[PDB]
A paper describes a structure:
G protein-coupled receptors (GPCRs) are ubiquitous cellular gatekeepers in eukaryotic organisms. They mediate sensory stimuli and cell signaling, regulating all major physiological processes, and therefore have historically been primary targets in the pharmaceutical industry. Here, we present a simple and efficient method, dubbed Complex-LCP (Crystallization of membrane proteins using transient ligand exchange in LCP), for structure determination of a target GPCR in complex with a panel of different ligands by taking advantage of the SFX method. Concurrent ligand exchange and crystallization is then initiated by overlaying a protein-laden LCP bolus with precipitant solution containing a large excess of the ligand of interest.
To demonstrate the general applicability of the described Complex-LCP method, we applied it to four other GPCRs: serotonin receptors 1B (5-HT1B) and 2B (5-HT2B), adenosine A2A receptor (A2AAR) and melatonin receptor type 1A (MT1). Melatonin receptor MT1 has recently been co-crystallized with several agonists, including two melatonin analogs as well as two drugs: the sleeping aid ramelteon and the atypical antidepressant agomelatine. Since addition of the ligand to the precipitant solution was essential for crystallization in all cases, indicating that ligand-exchange events happen on a timescale comparable to crystallization, we expected MT1 to be a suitable target for our Complex-LCP method. We used the antidepressant agomelatine (Ago) as a transient ligand during crystallization setups and successfully exchanged it for the larger 2-phenylmelatonin (2-PMT), as unambiguously identified in the resulting electron densities.
Numbering used by the authors: 23 to 218, 1001 to 1196, 228 to 321
Write the structure that this text describes.
Amino acid sequence: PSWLASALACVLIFTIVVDILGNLLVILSVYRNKKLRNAGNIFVVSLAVANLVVAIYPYPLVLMSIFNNGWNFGYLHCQVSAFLMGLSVIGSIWNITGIAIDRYLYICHSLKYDKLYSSKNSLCYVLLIWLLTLAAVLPNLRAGTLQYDPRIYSCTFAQSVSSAYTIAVVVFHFLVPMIIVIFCYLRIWILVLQVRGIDCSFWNESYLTGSRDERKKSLLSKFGMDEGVTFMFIGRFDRGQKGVDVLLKAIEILSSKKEFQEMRFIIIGKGDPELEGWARSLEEKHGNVKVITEMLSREFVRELYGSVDFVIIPSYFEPFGLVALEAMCLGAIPIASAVGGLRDIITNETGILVKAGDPGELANAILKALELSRSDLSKFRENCKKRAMSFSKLKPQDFRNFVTMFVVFVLFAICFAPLNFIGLAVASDPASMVPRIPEWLFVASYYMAYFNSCLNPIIYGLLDQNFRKEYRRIIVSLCTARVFFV
Ligand SMILES: COc1ccc2[nH]c(-c3ccccc3)c(CCNC(C)=O)c2c1
């Protein structure tokens, strides 16, 4: 591996200079730019320090130790250069975990309130992380798991010294954050999609005509059944997806009760012809249950939302669930099973929540829904309308900062995924798998993780226009131009 030594010098040389100047601009830009000066980006400076620390002291020692092919400094230099690298890399996730949490709170808050989320505790909240990162890394001095490795020319955490410490490192300081940050950004993506796909000019009460009671008496008279509390299912028919099967079991459970007489059901959809035969059966047996097996226009569906009292959404899985939100626009109060999407949308004040896949709990919800007077429903419909209106409030917003912080996270995971994956293979049998693991894969896994300390400024430049507009200002002020009297 002759040239493979010289190459490893380049990678660090790049990494140290880019990290030094790059993350120096990131601190400057946040202090210098009023748009980037918000307290939510306190985490970005804390992260840019963590990146920037390992280029002042550790990577210099490791760069020299490549050209030496050996450690030529003290054991303290080895024990301390290793220690700062751990304060960095562990702090760099737990910062990134904070950012992912911060921006989840930012979206959820801005739905519920009309005065931007302030990130009020962020400086105080950073000091919890740097205690958490100092508490996790500090035990490795006394246990003696920090030692020089000749393959990577560096002093670092030896995985093979104790598999108790590696598995604890890998689970608690990679897999636990990885799960938190995926969960955060996934639930953000659902909400930003729910925002994207809600046509407010279509799903609007304006397009309807009279009062509600009159429009309902019309709709029910149009199907040939009397006045009553009306319920509506509208989703394709299937044994386990959108949940028409749970509804039909629930209607049979209700049919015997005295309170059934005061109910009206309007089932819409097409799919399993046996479930269509089961629904058509309940149509023939009871005149208060109507079943519509063909394709209705969204024009007409709008009116049904506008006319009925409740919309039943008994879905097993339902990732986005606009059907709930669209219906709330026109005062339809959803009774809907707790699912990702519906748990985000439906609050406990707007509509009713049910344990998914249960005829009895759905029936007792329909019974709970029934025991509700005309005056009591008015506020529910108001809350439903206010709730759907908050999703359209976010439609024109700039969502690019979510991408910039997510791309930070994605590139982090890529760099440290190998090192943590290897660290589990080492943990299985330290004696066996230190030689058995491919020797290039060990070297690559480490030098990506180092290279990650120069990547944050490069990403902020390309994706966030405020940072790029400030790199122009920061660079063109210091270096470019000066005073000059004519
Ligand atoms: C928790 O104690 C420490 C203590 C010091 C540490 N230094 C590094 C490291 C820094 C840059 C590139 C590669 C590894 C780790 C991270 C080591 N993680 C694994 C799975 O081996 C580290 C951990």
